[PDB]
Amino acid sequence: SMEQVAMELRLTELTRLLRSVLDQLQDKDPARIFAQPVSLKEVPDYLDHIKHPMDFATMRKRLEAQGYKNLHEFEEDFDLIIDNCMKYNARDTVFYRAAVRLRDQGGVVLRQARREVDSIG
């Protein structure tokens, strides 16, 4: 139907905007601490601690499949990257500290993404 095509176009355009947001958030992680999944070979107990792992490569696979229907779903996955890190790692670590910085810098990006999503529809 034509209504379905129009919905599909809106999802495509959201995916475009979320790809720019994702790129802007990932630039705020210059050490690439959040780029890939925590390796279960290297951290074998990880899933005993963290029930829903997340990372930027995993988000990028979801995005490219148009698997974010709205900005809330995308932000849920970004918050998992930060929140998982801040539980598994202590305050005195480069990991925790990187997550704080990424949360603080990413909030700015996300505040304007929300206005654009609402404005454009």
mmCIF file of N, CA and C in Angstrom:
data_model
loop_
_atom_site.group_PDB
_atom_site.id
_atom_site.type_symbol
_atom_site.label_atom_id
_atom_site.label_comp_id
_atom_site.label_asym_id
_atom_site.label_seq_id
_atom_site.Cartn_x
_atom_site.Cartn_y
_atom_site.Cartn_z
ATOM 1 N N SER A 1 0.861 -1.178 0.000
ATOM 2 C CA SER A 1 0.000 0.000 0.000
ATOM 3 C C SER A 1 0.854 1.169 0.000
ATOM 4 N N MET A 2 0.322 2.305 -0.382
ATOM 5 C CA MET A 2 1.047 3.456 -0.312
ATOM 6 C C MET A 2 1.368 3.941 1.129
ATOM 7 N N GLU A 3 0.407 3.722 2.045
ATOM 8 C CA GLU A 3 0.612 4.071 3.474
ATOM 9 C C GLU A 3 1.874 3.323 4.039
ATOM 10 N N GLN A 4 1.990 2.059 3.654
ATOM 11 C CA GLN A 4 3.183 1.268 4.093
ATOM 12 C C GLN A 4 4.467 1.795 3.539
ATOM 13 N N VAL A 5 4.487 2.168 2.269
ATOM 14 C CA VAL A 5 5.662 2.824 1.728
ATOM 15 C C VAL A 5 6.009 4.110 2.443
ATOM 16 N N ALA A 6 4.984 4.892 2.803
ATOM 17 C CA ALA A 6 5.304 6.166 3.471
ATOM 18 C C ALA A 6 5.910 5.939 4.894
ATOM 19 N N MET A 7 5.360 4.955 5.571
ATOM 20 C CA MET A 7 5.909 4.532 6.886
ATOM 21 C C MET A 7 7.335 4.066 6.691
ATOM 22 N N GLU A 8 7.569 3.254 5.667
ATOM 23 C CA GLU A 8 8.936 2.804 5.378
ATOM 24 C C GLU A 8 9.879 3.927 5.071
ATOM 25 N N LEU A 9 9.451 4.964 4.365
ATOM 26 C CA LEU A 9 10.285 6.122 4.133
ATOM 27 C C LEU A 9 10.660 6.883 5.439
ATOM 28 N N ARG A 10 9.688 7.079 6.287
ATOM 29 C CA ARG A 10 9.894 7.725 7.595
ATOM 30 C C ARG A 10 10.943 6.886 8.377
ATOM 31 N N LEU A 11 10.815 5.562 8.384
ATOM 32 C CA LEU A 11 11.850 4.684 9.073
ATOM 33 C C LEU A 11 13.202 4.853 8.446
ATOM 34 N N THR A 12 13.317 4.955 7.114
ATOM 35 C CA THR A 12 14.536 5.225 6.466
ATOM 36 C C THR A 12 15.139 6.530 6.824
ATOM 37 N N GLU A 13 14.353 7.585 6.902
ATOM 38 C CA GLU A 13 14.845 8.863 7.273
ATOM 39 C C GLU A 13 15.279 8.885 8.781
ATOM 40 N N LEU A 14 14.538 8.233 9.617
ATOM 41 C CA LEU A 14 14.991 8.103 11.066
ATOM 42 C C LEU A 14 16.312 7.392 11.100
ATOM 43 N N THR A 15 16.479 6.307 10.327
ATOM 44 C CA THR A 15 17.732 5.572 10.309
ATOM 45 C C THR A 15 18.837 6.465 9.894
ATOM 46 N N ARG A 16 18.645 7.348 8.894
ATOM 47 C CA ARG A 16 19.663 8.297 8.492
ATOM 48 C C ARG A 16 20.096 9.243 9.614
ATOM 49 N N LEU A 17 19.117 9.786 10.281
ATOM 50 C CA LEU A 17 19.386 10.703 11.389
ATOM 51 C C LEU A 17 20.105 9.966 12.549
ATOM 52 N N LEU A 18 19.630 8.779 12.906
ATOM 53 C CA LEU A 18 20.319 7.948 13.959
ATOM 54 C C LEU A 18 21.697 7.544 13.567
ATOM 55 N N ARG A 19 21.995 7.348 12.273
ATOM 56 C CA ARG A 19 23.370 7.079 11.879
ATOM 57 C C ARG A 19 24.241 8.247 12.114
ATOM 58 N N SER A 20 23.834 9.478 11.845
ATOM 59 C CA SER A 20 24.603 10.661 12.168
ATOM 60 C C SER A 20 24.799 10.803 13.724
ATOM 61 N N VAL A 21 23.700 10.612 14.456
ATOM 62 C CA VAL A 21 23.801 10.635 15.960
ATOM 63 C C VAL A 21 24.839 9.599 16.414
ATOM 64 N N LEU A 22 24.795 8.400 15.900
ATOM 65 C CA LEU A 22 25.694 7.315 16.328
ATOM 66 C C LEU A 22 27.126 7.700 16.043
ATOM 67 N N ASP A 23 27.371 8.337 14.885
ATOM 68 C CA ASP A 23 28.692 8.729 14.561
ATOM 69 C C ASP A 23 29.193 9.790 15.440
ATOM 70 N N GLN A 24 28.353 10.742 15.808
ATOM 71 C CA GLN A 24 28.699 11.824 16.691
ATOM 72 C C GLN A 24 28.983 11.266 18.128
ATOM 73 N N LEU A 25 28.179 10.313 18.589
ATOM 74 C CA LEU A 25 28.420 9.719 19.961
ATOM 75 C C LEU A 25 29.688 8.943 19.932
ATOM 76 N N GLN A 26 29.972 8.144 18.928
ATOM 77 C CA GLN A 26 31.160 7.323 18.861
ATOM 78 C C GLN A 26 32.461 8.163 18.788
ATOM 79 N N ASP A 27 32.359 9.350 18.194
ATOM 80 C CA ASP A 27 33.512 10.315 18.242
ATOM 81 C C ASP A 27 33.844 10.724 19.654
ATOM 82 N N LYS A 28 32.921 10.708 20.605
ATOM 83 C CA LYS A 28 33.134 11.024 21.993
ATOM 84 C C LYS A 28 33.841 9.884 22.781
ATOM 85 N N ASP A 29 34.195 8.832 22.037
ATOM 86 C CA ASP A 29 34.955 7.627 22.580
ATOM 87 C C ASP A 29 36.154 7.427 21.778
ATOM 88 N N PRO A 30 37.085 8.420 21.966
ATOM 89 C CA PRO A 30 38.266 8.266 21.131
ATOM 90 C C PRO A 30 39.258 7.083 21.412
ATOM 91 N N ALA A 31 39.144 6.552 22.637
ATOM 92 C CA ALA A 31 39.916 5.407 23.004
ATOM 93 C C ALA A 31 39.331 4.068 22.465
ATOM 94 N N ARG A 32 38.110 4.116 21.865
ATOM 95 C CA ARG A 32 37.434 2.925 21.401
ATOM 96 C C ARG A 32 37.128 1.878 22.449
ATOM 97 N N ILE A 33 36.913 2.405 23.671
ATOM 98 C CA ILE A 33 36.559 1.546 24.784
ATOM 99 C C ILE A 33 35.207 0.862 24.628
ATOM 100 N N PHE A 34 34.307 1.490 23.875
ATOM 101 C CA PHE A 34 32.895 1.036 23.720
ATOM 102 C C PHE A 34 32.653 0.558 22.296
ATOM 103 N N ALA A 35 33.699 0.407 21.478
ATOM 104 C CA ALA A 35 33.511 0.073 20.087
ATOM 105 C C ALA A 35 33.034 -1.299 19.795
ATOM 106 N N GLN A 36 33.376 -2.279 20.612
ATOM 107 C CA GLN A 36 33.107 -3.664 20.362
ATOM 108 C C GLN A 36 32.502 -4.358 21.583
ATOM 109 N N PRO A 37 31.827 -5.482 21.450
ATOM 110 C CA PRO A 37 31.389 -6.223 22.636
ATOM 111 C C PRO A 37 32.473 -6.598 23.587
ATOM 112 N N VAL A 38 32.300 -6.570 24.892
ATOM 113 C CA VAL A 38 33.226 -7.191 25.846
ATOM 114 C C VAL A 38 33.381 -8.638 25.485
ATOM 115 N N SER A 39 34.634 -9.067 25.272
ATOM 116 C CA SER A 39 34.959 -10.435 24.866
ATOM 117 C C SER A 39 34.788 -11.445 26.070
ATOM 118 N N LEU A 40 33.992 -12.482 25.832
ATOM 119 C CA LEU A 40 33.726 -13.477 26.830
ATOM 120 C C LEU A 40 34.851 -14.447 26.931
ATOM 121 N N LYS A 41 35.765 -14.435 25.946
ATOM 122 C CA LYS A 41 37.023 -15.187 26.121
ATOM 123 C C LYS A 41 37.896 -14.525 27.117
ATOM 124 N N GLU A 42 38.052 -13.197 27.017
ATOM 125 C CA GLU A 42 38.823 -12.338 27.884
ATOM 126 C C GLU A 42 38.221 -11.987 29.296
ATOM 127 N N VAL A 43 36.895 -11.850 29.340
ATOM 128 C CA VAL A 43 36.190 -11.570 30.595
ATOM 129 C C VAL A 43 35.136 -12.648 30.763
ATOM 130 N N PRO A 44 35.547 -13.873 31.223
ATOM 131 C CA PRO A 44 34.658 -14.988 31.165
ATOM 132 C C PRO A 44 33.406 -14.975 32.079
ATOM 133 N N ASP A 45 33.477 -14.167 33.112
ATOM 134 C CA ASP A 45 32.340 -14.008 34.057
ATOM 135 C C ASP A 45 31.393 -12.883 33.636
ATOM 136 N N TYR A 46 31.562 -12.253 32.470
ATOM 137 C CA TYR A 46 30.859 -11.000 32.234
ATOM 138 C C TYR A 46 29.355 -11.128 32.342
ATOM 139 N N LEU A 47 28.773 -12.196 31.832
ATOM 140 C CA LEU A 47 27.339 -12.358 31.756
ATOM 141 C C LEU A 47 26.756 -12.741 33.121
ATOM 142 N N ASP A 48 27.580 -13.100 34.062
ATOM 143 C CA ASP A 48 27.077 -13.262 35.439
ATOM 144 C C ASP A 48 26.755 -11.863 36.001
ATOM 145 N N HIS A 49 27.467 -10.797 35.537
ATOM 146 C CA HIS A 49 27.326 -9.423 36.032
ATOM 147 C C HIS A 49 26.348 -8.677 35.208
ATOM 148 N N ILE A 50 26.468 -8.707 33.905
ATOM 149 C CA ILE A 50 25.766 -7.837 32.994
ATOM 150 C C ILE A 50 24.831 -8.675 32.136
ATOM 151 N N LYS A 51 23.553 -8.397 32.308
ATOM 152 C CA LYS A 51 22.535 -9.218 31.677
ATOM 153 C C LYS A 51 22.214 -8.799 30.269
ATOM 154 N N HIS A 52 22.472 -7.540 29.845
ATOM 155 C CA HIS A 52 22.184 -7.101 28.533
ATOM 156 C C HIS A 52 23.443 -6.273 28.026
ATOM 157 N N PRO A 53 24.462 -6.984 27.607
ATOM 158 C CA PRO A 53 25.653 -6.288 27.032
ATOM 159 C C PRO A 53 25.294 -5.427 25.843
ATOM 160 N N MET A 54 26.028 -4.351 25.644
ATOM 161 C CA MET A 54 25.821 -3.527 24.481
ATOM 162 C C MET A 54 27.157 -2.820 24.122
ATOM 163 N N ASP A 55 27.247 -2.381 22.871
ATOM 164 C CA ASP A 55 28.493 -1.742 22.363
ATOM 165 C C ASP A 55 28.148 -1.010 21.040
ATOM 166 N N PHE A 56 29.000 -0.174 20.517
ATOM 167 C CA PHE A 56 28.659 0.580 19.314
ATOM 168 C C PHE A 56 28.568 -0.318 18.060
ATOM 169 N N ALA A 57 29.377 -1.352 17.941
ATOM 170 C CA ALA A 57 29.244 -2.215 16.753
ATOM 171 C C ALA A 57 27.924 -2.910 16.739
ATOM 172 N N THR A 58 27.438 -3.364 17.858
ATOM 173 C CA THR A 58 26.149 -4.040 18.003
ATOM 174 C C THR A 58 25.036 -3.058 17.654
ATOM 175 N N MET A 59 25.111 -1.823 18.103
ATOM 176 C CA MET A 59 24.118 -0.814 17.765
ATOM 177 C C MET A 59 24.172 -0.571 16.272
ATOM 178 N N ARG A 60 25.333 -0.505 15.672
ATOM 179 C CA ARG A 60 25.439 -0.204 14.247
ATOM 180 C C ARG A 60 24.776 -1.334 13.459
ATOM 181 N N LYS A 61 24.911 -2.587 13.851
ATOM 182 C CA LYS A 61 24.229 -3.722 13.130
ATOM 183 C C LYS A 61 22.714 -3.572 13.219
ATOM 184 N N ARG A 62 22.204 -3.234 14.368
ATOM 185 C CA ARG A 62 20.780 -2.988 14.527
ATOM 186 C C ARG A 62 20.331 -1.815 13.684
ATOM 187 N N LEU A 63 21.027 -0.729 13.691
ATOM 188 C CA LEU A 63 20.671 0.413 12.925
ATOM 189 C C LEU A 63 20.593 0.084 11.457
ATOM 190 N N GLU A 64 21.572 -0.613 10.937
ATOM 191 C CA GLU A 64 21.623 -0.827 9.468
ATOM 192 C C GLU A 64 20.576 -1.779 8.978
ATOM 193 N N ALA A 65 20.024 -2.570 9.849
ATOM 194 C CA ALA A 65 18.863 -3.348 9.605
ATOM 195 C C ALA A 65 17.552 -2.550 9.841
ATOM 196 N N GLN A 66 17.679 -1.215 9.992
ATOM 197 C CA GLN A 66 16.493 -0.398 10.411
ATOM 198 C C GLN A 66 15.752 -0.935 11.609
ATOM 199 N N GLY A 67 16.482 -1.445 12.668
ATOM 200 C CA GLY A 67 15.890 -2.010 13.804
ATOM 201 C C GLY A 67 15.601 -1.073 15.008
ATOM 202 N N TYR A 68 15.827 0.219 14.794
ATOM 203 C CA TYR A 68 15.369 1.217 15.765
ATOM 204 C C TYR A 68 14.095 1.922 15.176
ATOM 205 N N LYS A 69 13.034 1.714 15.868
ATOM 206 C CA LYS A 69 11.725 2.291 15.389
ATOM 207 C C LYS A 69 11.503 3.709 15.816
ATOM 208 N N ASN A 70 12.189 4.125 16.892
ATOM 209 C CA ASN A 70 12.063 5.454 17.433
ATOM 210 C C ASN A 70 13.408 5.818 18.148
ATOM 211 N N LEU A 71 13.539 7.056 18.559
ATOM 212 C CA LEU A 71 14.769 7.507 19.226
ATOM 213 C C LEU A 71 14.872 6.865 20.604
ATOM 214 N N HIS A 72 13.808 6.624 21.324
ATOM 215 C CA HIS A 72 13.839 5.983 22.651
ATOM 216 C C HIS A 72 14.526 4.633 22.604
ATOM 217 N N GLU A 73 14.261 3.834 21.608
ATOM 218 C CA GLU A 73 14.872 2.522 21.515
ATOM 219 C C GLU A 73 16.405 2.675 21.343
ATOM 220 N N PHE A 74 16.844 3.609 20.538
ATOM 221 C CA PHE A 74 18.259 3.909 20.309
ATOM 222 C C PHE A 74 18.894 4.387 21.599
ATOM 223 N N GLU A 75 18.258 5.332 22.267
ATOM 224 C CA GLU A 75 18.803 5.781 23.550
ATOM 225 C C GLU A 75 18.855 4.724 24.590
ATOM 226 N N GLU A 76 17.946 3.779 24.620
ATOM 227 C CA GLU A 76 18.011 2.666 25.578
ATOM 228 C C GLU A 76 19.324 1.882 25.396
ATOM 229 N N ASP A 77 19.688 1.618 24.148
ATOM 230 C CA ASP A 77 20.915 0.866 23.867
ATOM 231 C C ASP A 77 22.137 1.745 24.217
ATOM 232 N N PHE A 78 22.142 3.031 23.904
ATOM 233 C CA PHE A 78 23.266 3.862 24.340
ATOM 234 C C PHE A 78 23.424 3.899 25.848
ATOM 235 N N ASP A 79 22.330 3.968 26.576
ATOM 236 C CA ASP A 79 22.378 4.017 28.030
ATOM 237 C C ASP A 79 22.911 2.670 28.523
ATOM 238 N N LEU A 80 22.614 1.548 27.908
ATOM 239 C CA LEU A 80 23.165 0.257 28.329
ATOM 240 C C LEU A 80 24.706 0.249 28.235
ATOM 241 N N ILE A 81 25.238 0.833 27.158
ATOM 242 C CA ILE A 81 26.721 0.902 27.032
ATOM 243 C C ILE A 81 27.267 1.563 28.290
ATOM 244 N N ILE A 82 26.768 2.715 28.672
ATOM 245 C CA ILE A 82 27.268 3.498 29.811
ATOM 246 C C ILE A 82 26.998 2.772 31.132
ATOM 247 N N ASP A 83 25.741 2.366 31.318
ATOM 248 C CA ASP A 83 25.324 1.819 32.599
ATOM 249 C C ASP A 83 25.969 0.491 32.918
ATOM 250 N N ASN A 84 26.174 -0.340 31.905
ATOM 251 C CA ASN A 84 26.842 -1.620 32.095
ATOM 252 C C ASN A 84 28.280 -1.400 32.605
ATOM 253 N N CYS A 85 28.917 -0.422 31.958
ATOM 254 C CA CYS A 85 30.331 -0.093 32.306
ATOM 255 C C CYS A 85 30.469 0.425 33.668
ATOM 256 N N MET A 86 29.572 1.299 34.076
ATOM 257 C CA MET A 86 29.640 1.889 35.405
ATOM 258 C C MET A 86 29.264 0.941 36.538
ATOM 259 N N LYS A 87 28.678 -0.175 36.213
ATOM 260 C CA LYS A 87 28.480 -1.219 37.242
ATOM 261 C C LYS A 87 29.675 -2.198 37.311
ATOM 262 N N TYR A 88 30.127 -2.688 36.161
ATOM 263 C CA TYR A 88 31.193 -3.690 36.171
ATOM 264 C C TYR A 88 32.527 -3.157 36.629
ATOM 265 N N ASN A 89 32.804 -1.881 36.293
ATOM 266 C CA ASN A 89 34.086 -1.245 36.588
ATOM 267 C C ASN A 89 33.987 -0.299 37.695
ATOM 268 N N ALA A 90 34.992 -0.165 38.563
ATOM 269 C CA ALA A 90 34.979 0.773 39.695
ATOM 270 C C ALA A 90 35.262 2.163 39.254
ATOM 271 N N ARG A 91 35.004 3.133 40.141
ATOM 272 C CA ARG A 91 35.214 4.569 39.866
ATOM 273 C C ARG A 91 36.618 4.978 39.519
ATOM 274 N N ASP A 92 37.600 4.267 40.012
ATOM 275 C CA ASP A 92 39.034 4.552 39.829
ATOM 276 C C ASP A 92 39.589 3.954 38.540
ATOM 277 N N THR A 93 38.732 3.570 37.594
ATOM 278 C CA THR A 93 39.219 2.944 36.380
ATOM 279 C C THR A 93 39.045 3.795 35.177
ATOM 280 N N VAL A 94 39.930 3.575 34.177
ATOM 281 C CA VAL A 94 39.783 4.292 32.906
ATOM 282 C C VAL A 94 38.459 3.966 32.211
ATOM 283 N N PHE A 95 37.941 2.755 32.444
ATOM 284 C CA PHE A 95 36.662 2.358 31.831
ATOM 285 C C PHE A 95 35.486 3.166 32.370
ATOM 286 N N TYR A 96 35.373 3.210 33.710
ATOM 287 C CA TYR A 96 34.288 3.970 34.328
ATOM 288 C C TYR A 96 34.336 5.425 33.879
ATOM 289 N N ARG A 97 35.579 5.989 33.981
ATOM 290 C CA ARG A 97 35.765 7.385 33.687
ATOM 291 C C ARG A 97 35.401 7.685 32.201
ATOM 292 N N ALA A 98 35.734 6.776 31.323
ATOM 293 C CA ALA A 98 35.385 6.959 29.896
ATOM 294 C C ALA A 98 33.847 6.999 29.706
ATOM 295 N N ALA A 99 33.178 6.125 30.467
ATOM 296 C CA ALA A 99 31.713 6.100 30.413
ATOM 297 C C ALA A 99 31.083 7.398 30.913
ATOM 298 N N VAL A 100 31.619 7.962 32.015
ATOM 299 C CA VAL A 100 31.119 9.262 32.494
ATOM 300 C C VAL A 100 31.268 10.336 31.420
ATOM 301 N N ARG A 101 32.432 10.391 30.803
ATOM 302 C CA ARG A 101 32.690 11.388 29.784
ATOM 303 C C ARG A 101 31.821 11.210 28.588
ATOM 304 N N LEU A 102 31.607 9.981 28.182
ATOM 305 C CA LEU A 102 30.732 9.699 27.038
ATOM 306 C C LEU A 102 29.292 10.031 27.367
ATOM 307 N N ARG A 103 28.787 9.732 28.567
ATOM 308 C CA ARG A 103 27.458 10.104 28.995
ATOM 309 C C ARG A 103 27.301 11.639 28.930
ATOM 310 N N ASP A 104 28.255 12.371 29.450
ATOM 311 C CA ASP A 104 28.155 13.829 29.600
ATOM 312 C C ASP A 104 28.184 14.465 28.230
ATOM 313 N N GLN A 105 29.124 14.073 27.404
ATOM 314 C CA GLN A 105 29.213 14.619 26.036
ATOM 315 C C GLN A 105 28.102 14.131 25.169
ATOM 316 N N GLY A 106 27.640 12.938 25.315
ATOM 317 C CA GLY A 106 26.577 12.383 24.460
ATOM 318 C C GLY A 106 25.236 13.021 24.769
ATOM 319 N N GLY A 107 25.006 13.438 26.003
ATOM 320 C CA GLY A 107 23.723 14.075 26.388
ATOM 321 C C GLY A 107 23.424 15.285 25.549
ATOM 322 N N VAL A 108 24.456 16.032 25.249
ATOM 323 C CA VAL A 108 24.318 17.243 24.450
ATOM 324 C C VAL A 108 23.784 16.903 23.006
ATOM 325 N N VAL A 109 24.385 15.888 22.423
ATOM 326 C CA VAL A 109 24.053 15.367 21.089
ATOM 327 C C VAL A 109 22.610 14.873 21.079
ATOM 328 N N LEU A 110 22.245 14.098 22.082
ATOM 329 C CA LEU A 110 20.952 13.526 22.195
ATOM 330 C C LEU A 110 19.868 14.570 22.463
ATOM 331 N N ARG A 111 20.169 15.627 23.194
ATOM 332 C CA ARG A 111 19.181 16.677 23.430
ATOM 333 C C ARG A 111 18.749 17.271 22.080
ATOM 334 N N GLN A 112 19.673 17.486 21.152
ATOM 335 C CA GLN A 112 19.267 18.110 19.910
ATOM 336 C C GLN A 112 18.663 17.061 18.955
ATOM 337 N N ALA A 113 19.089 15.796 19.008
ATOM 338 C CA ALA A 113 18.481 14.754 18.254
ATOM 339 C C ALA A 113 17.013 14.633 18.562
ATOM 340 N N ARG A 114 16.656 14.724 19.819
ATOM 341 C CA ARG A 114 15.241 14.654 20.226
ATOM 342 C C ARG A 114 14.402 15.804 19.597
ATOM 343 N N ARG A 115 14.960 16.999 19.603
ATOM 344 C CA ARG A 115 14.228 18.158 19.014
ATOM 345 C C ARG A 115 14.058 17.893 17.523
ATOM 346 N N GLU A 116 15.056 17.358 16.809
ATOM 347 C CA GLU A 116 15.000 17.101 15.331
ATOM 348 C C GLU A 116 14.009 16.017 14.967
ATOM 349 N N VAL A 117 14.006 14.959 15.770
ATOM 350 C CA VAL A 117 13.063 13.886 15.575
ATOM 351 C C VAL A 117 11.642 14.410 15.714
ATOM 352 N N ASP A 118 11.356 15.170 16.771
ATOM 353 C CA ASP A 118 10.031 15.764 17.010
ATOM 354 C C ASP A 118 9.674 16.801 15.951
ATOM 355 N N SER A 119 10.631 17.663 15.621
ATOM 356 C CA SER A 119 10.396 18.732 14.630
ATOM 357 C C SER A 119 10.048 18.171 13.228
ATOM 358 N N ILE A 120 10.932 17.331 12.673
ATOM 359 C CA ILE A 120 10.714 16.703 11.345
ATOM 360 C C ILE A 120 9.538 15.707 11.353
ATOM 361 N N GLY A 121 9.203 15.160 12.523
ATOM 362 C CA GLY A 121 8.205 14.087 12.672
ATOM 363 C C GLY A 121 8.869 12.754 12.383
#
